[PDB]
Amino acid sequence: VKWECPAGYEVKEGLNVDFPHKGMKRAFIVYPAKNVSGPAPVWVPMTGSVESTNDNLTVARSGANSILADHGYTVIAPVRACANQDPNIRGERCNGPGSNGWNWNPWFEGRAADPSGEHWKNDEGPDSSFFVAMVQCVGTKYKLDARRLFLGGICSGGTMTNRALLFRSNFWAGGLPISGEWYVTSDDGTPLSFDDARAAVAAAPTKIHQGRVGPYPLPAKVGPLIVMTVWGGEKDLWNCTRPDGSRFLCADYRPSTQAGSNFFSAQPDVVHVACSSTHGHMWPQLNTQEFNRWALDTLASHPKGSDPRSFKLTQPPEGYTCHVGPFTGLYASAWS
Numbered sequence: 001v002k003w004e005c006p007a008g009y010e011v012k013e014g015l016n017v018d019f020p021h022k023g024m025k026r027a028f029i030v031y032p033a034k035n036v037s038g039p040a041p042v043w044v045p046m047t048g049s050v051e052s053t054n055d056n057l058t059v060a061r062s063g064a065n066s067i068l069a070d071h072g073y074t075v076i077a078p079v080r081a082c083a084n085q086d087p088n089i090r091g092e093r094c095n096g097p098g099s100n101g102w103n104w105n106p107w108f109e110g111r112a113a114d115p116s117g118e119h120w121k122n123d124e125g126p127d128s129s130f131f132v133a134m135v136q137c138v139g140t141k142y143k144l145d146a147r148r149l150f151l152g153g154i155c156s157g158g159t160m161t162n163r164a165l166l167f168r169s170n171f172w173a174g175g176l177p178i179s180g181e182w183y184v185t186s187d188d189g190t191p192l193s194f195d196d197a198r199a200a201v202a203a204a205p206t207k208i209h210q211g212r213v214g215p216y217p218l219p220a221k222v223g224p225l226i227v228m229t230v231w232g233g234e235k236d237l238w239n240c241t242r243p244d245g246s247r248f249l250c251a252d253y254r255p256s257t258q259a260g261s262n263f264f265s266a267q268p269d270v271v272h273v274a275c276s277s278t279h280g281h282m283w284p285q286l287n288t289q290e291f292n293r294w295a296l297d298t299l300a301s302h303p304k305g306s307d308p309r310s311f312k313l314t315q316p317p318e319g320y321t322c323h324v325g326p327f328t329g330l331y332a333s334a335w336s
Contacts, residue, residue: 001149005137021126027085027087034069034072041145042074045065045153046153046161048154052090071293103117108120112191112212152178154179155179157178173224176295178232181211182211183197185210201258205331208266230276232281233278235281236252237252237281238251265326271306274323277319294316
């Protein structure tokens with residue numbers, strides 16, 4: 001990691017706007033760590049399709065992620081490009097299909113199913129690179145621990161966490177993709193419909209599946225990481241909204257959390273923790289702050305470059321079941 005900012009950019013505590021990156025003007029909010037001397041671990045929380053960044057940071061039911069600063073983490077929270085730097089935008093002009101080859105508009109988190117997405121098969125996209133520039137700039141003002149830079153998020157922010165970990169595994173120390181997509185494809189990269197992607201994982205639940213969330217093909221080896229993937233149970237599903245207001249199922253997080261866990265668990269320098277809860281498709285609801293504390297401290301216990309054999313999982317809060325390895329309670333096993 002290199003600490004540097006766009007020339008003349010003056011980072012500040014709180015809201016930062018007009019940060020220049022790849023021709024766009026971006027914004028992000030900084031909450032410096034409390035009760036910490038020396039470099040602090042970093043948490044980069046990302047909202048989803050409808051909650052605002054302010055909701056994700058300050059509303060309890062949305063995770064109140066800014067409270068992690070009171071827990072000793074410097075929180076650096078990006079605003080979605082579609083929100084035009086307004087951290088209060090919720091779903092307006094954000095909650096819907098993407099443009100310019102992107103699948104979904106909240107974040108540049110997956111290539112589209114049509115040929116316009118081809119270019120994103122091997123270019124991380126402007127959000128993955130923005131986050132790296134953002135953290136590198138904040139680190140010129142606040143002391144950040146370069147071995148403990150973590151990002152994470154819910155829904156589309158979870159999908160973005162997955163993309164960022166696959167393209168920038170030599171920067172981040174790990175992440176927390178909560179109910180994010182994988183956009184499972186065939187091995188040859190062919191995009192699959194929601195239905196066909198869902199069936200592919202059910203038919204081969206322990207295999208590594210390619211997906212539009214990441215590089216095509218997925219990398220043979222990624223940098224050292226700890227990744228904690230969270231599934232919200234039977235109701236962890238998303239219904240899209242048509243132009244006419246009607247709703248329809250368009251994402252099921254059982255196959256995407258399984259697929260992510262298969263890929264990350266197979267990686268030799270990655271500790272993968274699979275966590276299950278029953279809250280559905282939203283920020284973890286049972287003992288929310290206890291979960292945020294447990295999850296970030298778990299990630300922080302595996303600083304970048306740590307030996308996976310040295311990792312020791314502690315019990316999560318009531319309402320969660322977690323273990324090291326791929327998910328196992330989502331599909332019936334072969335031997336069964």
